[PDB]
Amino acid sequence: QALKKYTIDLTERAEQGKLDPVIGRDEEIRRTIQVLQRRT
Amino acid sequence: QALKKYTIDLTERAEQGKLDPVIGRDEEIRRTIQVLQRRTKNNPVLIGEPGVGKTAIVEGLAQRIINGEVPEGLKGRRVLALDMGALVAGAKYRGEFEERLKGVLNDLAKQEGNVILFIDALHTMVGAGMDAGNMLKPALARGELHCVGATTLDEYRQYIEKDAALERRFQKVFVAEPSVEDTIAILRGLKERYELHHHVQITDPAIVAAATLSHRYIADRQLPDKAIDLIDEAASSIRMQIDSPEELDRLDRRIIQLKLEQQALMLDMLNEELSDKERQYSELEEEWKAEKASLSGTQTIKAELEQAKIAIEQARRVGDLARMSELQYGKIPELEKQLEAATQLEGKTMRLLRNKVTDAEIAEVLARWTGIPVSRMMESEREKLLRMEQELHHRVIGQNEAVDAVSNAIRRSRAGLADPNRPIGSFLFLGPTGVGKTELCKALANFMFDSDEAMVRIDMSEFMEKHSVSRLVGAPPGYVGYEEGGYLTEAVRRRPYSVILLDAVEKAHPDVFNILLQVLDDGRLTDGQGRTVDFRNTVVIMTSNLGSDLIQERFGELDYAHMKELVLGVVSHNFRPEFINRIDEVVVFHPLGEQHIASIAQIQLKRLYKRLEERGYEIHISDEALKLLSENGYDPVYGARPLKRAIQQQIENPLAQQILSGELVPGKVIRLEVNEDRIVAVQH
Amino acid sequence: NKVTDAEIAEVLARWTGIPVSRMMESEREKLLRMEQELHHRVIGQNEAVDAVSNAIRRSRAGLADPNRPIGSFLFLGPTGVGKTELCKALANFMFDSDEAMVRIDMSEFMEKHSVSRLVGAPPGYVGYEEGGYLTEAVRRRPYSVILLDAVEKAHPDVFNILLQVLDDGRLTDGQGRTVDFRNTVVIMTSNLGSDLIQERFGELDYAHMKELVLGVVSHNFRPEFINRIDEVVVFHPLGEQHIASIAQIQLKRLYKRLEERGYEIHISDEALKLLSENGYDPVYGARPLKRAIQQQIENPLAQQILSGELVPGKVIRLEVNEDRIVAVQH
Amino acid sequence: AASSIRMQIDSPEELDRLDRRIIQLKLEQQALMLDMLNEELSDKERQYSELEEEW
Amino acid sequence: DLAKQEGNVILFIDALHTMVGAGMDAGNMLKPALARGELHCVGATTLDEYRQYIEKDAALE
Numbered sequence A: 001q002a003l004k005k006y007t008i009d010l011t012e013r014a015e016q017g018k019l020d021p022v023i024g025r026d027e028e029i030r031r032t033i034q035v036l037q038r039r040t
Numbered sequence B: 001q002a003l004k005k006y007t008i009d010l011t012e013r014a015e016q017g018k019l020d021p022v023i024g025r026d027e028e029i030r031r032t033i034q035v036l037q038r039r040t041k042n043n044p045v046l047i048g049e050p051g052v053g054k055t056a057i058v059e060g061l062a063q064r065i066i067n068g069e070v071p072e073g074l075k076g077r078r079v080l081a082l083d084m085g086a087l088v089a090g091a092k093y094r095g096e097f098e099e100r101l102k103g104v105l106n107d108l109a110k111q112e113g114n115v116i117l118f119i120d121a122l123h124t125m126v127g128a129g130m131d132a133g134n135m136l137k138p139a140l141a142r143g144e145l146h147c148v149g150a151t152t153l154d155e156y157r158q159y160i161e162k163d164a165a166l167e168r169r170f171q172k173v174f175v176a177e178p179s180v181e182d183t184i185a186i187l188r189g190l191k192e193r194y195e196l197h198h199h200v201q202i203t204d205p206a207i208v209a210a211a212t213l214s215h216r217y218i219a220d221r222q223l224p225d226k227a228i229d230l231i232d233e234a235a236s237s238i239r240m241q242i243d244s245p246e247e248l249d250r251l252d253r254r255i256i257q258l259k260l261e262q263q264a265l266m267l268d269m270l271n272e273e274l275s276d277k278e279r280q281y282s283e284l285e286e287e288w289k290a291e292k293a294s295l296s297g298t299q300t301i302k303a304e305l306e307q308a309k310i311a312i313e314q315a316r317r318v319g320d321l322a323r324m325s326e327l328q329y330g331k332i333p334e335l336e337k338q339l340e341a342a343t344q345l346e347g348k349t350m351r352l353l354r355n356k357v358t359d360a361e362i363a364e365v366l367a368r369w370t371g372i373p374v375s376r377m378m379e380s381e382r383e384k385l386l387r388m389e390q391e392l393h394h395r396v397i398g399q400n401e402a403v404d405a406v407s408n409a410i411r412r413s414r415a416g417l418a419d420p421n422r423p424i425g426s427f428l429f430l431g432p433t434g435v436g437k438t439e440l441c442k443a444l445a446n447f448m449f450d451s452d453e454a455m456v457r458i459d460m461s462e463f464m465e466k467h468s469v470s471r472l473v474g475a476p477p478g479y480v481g482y483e484e485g486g487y488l489t490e491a492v493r494r495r496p497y498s499v500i501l502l503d504a505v506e507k508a509h510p511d512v513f514n515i516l517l518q519v520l521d522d523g524r525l526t527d528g529q530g531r532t533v534d535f536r537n538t539v540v541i542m543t544s545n546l547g548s549d550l551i552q553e554r555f556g557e558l559d560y561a562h563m564k565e566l567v568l569g570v571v572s573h574n575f576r577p578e579f580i581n582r583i584d585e586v587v588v589f590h591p592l593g594e595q596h597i598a599s600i601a602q603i604q605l606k607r608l609y610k611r612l613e614e615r616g617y618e619i620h621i622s623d624e625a626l627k628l629l630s631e632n633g634y635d636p637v638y639g640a641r642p643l644k645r646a647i648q649q650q651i652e653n654p655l656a657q658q659i660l661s662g663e664l665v666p667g668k669v670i671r672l673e674v675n676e677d678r679i680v681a682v683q684h
Numbered sequence C: 001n002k003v004t005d006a007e008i009a010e011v012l013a014r015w016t017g018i019p020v021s022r023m024m025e026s027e028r029e030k031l032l033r034m035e036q037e038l039h040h041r042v043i044g045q046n047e048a049v050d051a052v053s054n055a056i057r058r059s060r061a062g063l064a065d066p067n068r069p070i071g072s073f074l075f076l077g078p079t080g081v082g083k084t085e086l087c088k089a090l091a092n093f094m095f096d097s098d099e100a101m102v103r104i105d106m107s108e109f110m111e112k113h114s115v116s117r118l119v120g121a122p123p124g125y126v127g128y129e130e131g132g133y134l135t136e137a138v139r140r141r142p143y144s145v146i147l148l149d150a151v152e153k154a155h156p157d158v159f160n161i162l163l164q165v166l167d168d169g170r171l172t173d174g175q176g177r178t179v180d181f182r183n184t185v186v187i188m189t190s191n192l193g194s195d196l197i198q199e200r201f202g203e204l205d206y207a208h209m210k211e212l213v214l215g216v217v218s219h220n221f222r223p224e225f226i227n228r229i230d231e232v233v234v235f236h237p238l239g240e241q242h243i244a245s246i247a248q249i250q251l252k253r254l255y256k257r258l259e260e261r262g263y264e265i266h267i268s269d270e271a272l273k274l275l276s277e278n279g280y281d282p283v284y285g286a287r288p289l290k291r292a293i294q295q296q297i298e299n300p301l302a303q304q305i306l307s308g309e310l311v312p313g314k315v316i317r318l319e320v321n322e323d324r325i326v327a328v329q330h
Numbered sequence D: 001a002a003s004s005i006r007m008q009i010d011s012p013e014e015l016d017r018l019d020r021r022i023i024q025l026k027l028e029q030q031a032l033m034l035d036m037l038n039e040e041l042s043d044k045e046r047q048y049s050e051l052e053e054e055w
Numbered sequence E: 001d002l003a004k005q006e007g008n009v010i011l012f013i014d015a016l017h018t019m020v021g022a023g024m025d026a027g028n029m030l031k032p033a034l035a036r037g038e039l040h041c042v043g044a045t046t047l048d049e050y051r052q053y054i055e056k057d058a059a060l061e
């Protein structure tokens, strides 16, 4: 499949715990998801 | 086959129903249809300032073509869109671009006029590395190609209307910026679309209020797109607040705290407390799940009704007849009444919060956009405004008349009662210098709007000059500081709701009052760049001090009214009456008694003890020293600025002289006890 | 299937915006009614009613000059006699808004060399890509009434620009294209002879009024520039029935905004009488009326709204106090 | 103007206004479904049919 | 793949300007997929590339 050919899963990396639990910015992530669950 | 390679059928997508039944504009739709159905020059262009959805106007044209609302010369056409950038894939080699374009044109010649071309952003065809208009031009004079132009008026008169041939291949269709009620009707259609999409409910009076406040205040975007985006933003905000759950997270943190505590312990009763709080959390969570199941059932049965609408529109396009009757008479009224039964079931069961959006939520989103509370008179800020004078007299000693006047202005503002076409209030301030005119404006913006800073001071003793006026407006174009904007204006347009101080205008040249005439009649001002920025949602204030001699004479035992009248006659000697008639509202400040000096000094002690607790110091005072300072810091000409400098020269220097002598320990009781002429601090 | 000249005039009107079409009967009724409507929303000043009625009649009948632009009017009157509001009522008739007008606020222009605000900047300076705002706003709305506000505050001979405008009204803009004014209307407002007006609106007719203030403004302007104007009309300081009518109109739009708030508000006519007693002065015209209305109505009214006395669905008779007005809830 | 006249031929205006009238009366009758609105619908549809046949 | 995963996958692309400058060279192939909604990707750059590429195509804006 063409998925694995040219993609990099970061969610696998945090799923395999490779990554950095940075603290904070939760309002900004919230406003991001506010954008993310729009229609336009 | 480049049509397969580069273009996308809208009418496939509208055949798939993917787009908007866009309301209105119907004369312009028809006029588009007129210009299309000619024999030559078949390509009209769409024009305006953006955020009006001309894209969607082409979409609705295609949807009417699907529905056959067109004359009998377009039934069966092909409305296809193409980017100019779509053929800038490989722009190095020679003719490659042009070979793509000619292959497109030969495809369209082979399709023989049954295809209507759409182009968005027609100015993308202007300059592309001659290039592009020098191939379309024979088709576009000959009308064999069926282009549809849609672009922004700035790019129109910037790119095309300086290139004359491309101007004469096209005809203007000026879409207006829509009205209020047009916005309302389209937002009813969009209420439909969003409650189809965003899984929620919307209040339609909140929608028309949202449209009202969007058109009314924010001039940044334009109609109707700003209200569209606001409704989308509020819908998604409440949509995230569907899976917020705040009280569930409170209970979950509580039960996990009690679980950690019990696991640390292993009299107990903590097991019982954990069991009770977990039962509470489980009950709240189960109510949450029941609400989610209710909303999910409501949205699914709404989607099933929408698919029934899709099928009955398939019967409208195709033309089965008993299918229409069957789908209507079965599906519509029973699904509507059980959708309303689910709606009133939610109106029963929704506690953990909503799925509606109200105008309070609109004003929340608005303040998150604006920063300005028109989040309405909610009996906290409202009852602040009911105590607004008593708010001010934290810092406003005496002087109650202007306090009344200012609070009157604010009340006429934030209750929404003003004629908003003048500004919020024009003001002349009079009276003795060194009372807190600046304090008044600071406390105004403080307990009204932000703070003691959210303002613009403009000191008018600079402004003895014609070129001073040239500064504060903005320079004329074809001069130096054109490219930067005016002094006042861009600072206004960043902070749309401020209070502007024009202090001491009597030192300025009398020319300035013309600029104030345009403002204080109108609240709109035309800058260097020829454009106009609103004031009318701000507050403008001038100060003067001329007959403060006469005030210091006669405020002892004359009234307020004839005092006002006499000093306004003096102002008529000063200004033009043609300007002060444009002035709304004038006060007089009066000289204070020394009790007011003592009170302001108490306020200075308050902010001093604030500063020293910020240093860490717990300091009190003998008030005989306050009596001495009240004896010291006055003149009849300046008043309180002598008190401020005396506070400095007898407090801020020697107390720091002893702190940096290492005498003073934070936390000790430090009485500012008197001396013969000085103040001693103690270490207790 | 026969194409007539009315078809062409409508296609032109919809294709540009200029109201070319032959005088249909709703429009002609509306023109007689707009004579009436400018009596309505402008109480007072029926000289101006006459003048601008004649202006738009010489427009829409299609008889006035295809050389000169259509009207040309240098208004004279003292403060607040409705001049700006006259032209806004013209637009709100004609364009169903106030925000379809060219309101070039003229008192910015106190030194000379901001003419480039209105023309554009000549090539090889800054504003060559942008124009000057008058020309752009004309060429987008080719039928639009242009107002030039309080015009004599400026440096005096800015209006060689307006010598072109009122002469032939092709306007050579910055870049070098033609800004044509033949379907438009230029209005100025000035308050020069206003002290003579309030001095001598009595003891003169309309004509010697016009004569003497024309002599004065001719001392102010240049004799070139007075020759270009169609009719130098004069305004008059208003009597107290006009004051009462203005008060009524302000009450109606006040009622409008508060019924948009959602409140049914009446008044004592004695309260109107108190307003009429508390709004008259010859020297200042209409604004002491309006701000007296503002204070002595709105501030107790907004106070009681922020009290929450005002329940909707109640007739709110603005009845008098001893000297003031209370709102009642019945 | 030529294609404008062609579309005003190809539309028709008052015929489609009467068509809006008859479809509104059909909706109103089915919202009622004494009647006599059936008779009024038949009258307006006969009017529209005569106009359409003339068209 | 954007068609296949049906919006269950939202990919991430930082350096949105590098999608703008990639040779439609990459961007306006995907302005369909973001406009149509097979992808809801997240941008990450500085204000200068915002004014340089994101503001400069107003459709991208």
Ligand SMILES: Nc1ncnc2c1ncn2[C@@H]1O[C@H](COP(=O)(O)OP(=O)(O)OP(O)(O)=S)[C@@H](O)[C@H]1O
Pocket: B020, B021, B022, B023, B024, B049, B050, B051, B052, B053, B054, B055, B056, B057, B186, B189, B190, B225, B228, E058, E059
């Ligand atoms: N009648 C309508 N019904 C539904 N949505 C509409 C309607 N008119 C406009 N819109 C929406 O308004 C949005 C923004 O307007 P646009 O037409 O896209 O702006 P524009 O002026 O065309 O410039 P662009 O390049 O298209 S953003 C559209 O994408 C539509 O979703």
Ligand SMILES: Nc1ncnc2c1ncn2[C@@H]1O[C@H](COP(=O)(O)OP(=O)(O)OP(O)(O)=S)[C@@H](O)[C@H]1O
Pocket: B521, B578, B582, C041, C042, C043, C044, C045, C077, C078, C079, C080, C081, C082, C083, C084, C085, C086, C150, C189, C190, C191, C238, C242, C246, C286, C287, C290
């Ligand atoms: N006949 C009238 N009908 C309606 N409103 C009027 C009338 N006469 C005066 N007004 C009011 O008077 C004010 C006039 O506003 P403006 O025209 O801007 O003032 P002005 O006429 O420009 O006076 P100056 O000389 O420029 S200060 C408005 O508030 C009008 O409502």
Ligand SMILES: Nc1ncnc2c1ncn2[C@@H]1O[C@H](COP(=O)(O)OP(=O)(O)O)[C@@H](O)[C@H]1O
Pocket: A019, A020, A021, A022, A023, E044
């Ligand atoms: N809370 C955090 N947890 C883990 N890593 C972090 C955190 N905060 C910052 N970093 C590190 O800081 C670096 C910043 O890089 P990045 O944020 O990707 O650049 P940019 O700020 O341009 O996006 C990252 O490589 C990341 O590993």
Ligand SMILES: Nc1ncnc2c1ncn2[C@@H]1O[C@H](COP(=O)(O)OP(=O)(O)O)[C@@H](O)[C@H]1O
Pocket: B394, B395, B396, B397, B398, B399, B432, B433, B434, B435, B436, B437, B438, B439, B600, B603, B640, B641, B644
């Ligand atoms: N009403 C008041 N409430 C609180 N403090 C005030 C008040 N009036 C005056 N002050 C004091 O008066 C001084 C006056 O400052 P400023 O406003 O610049 O002078 P003026 O009032 O003469 O323009 C301030 O420094 C402040 O310490």
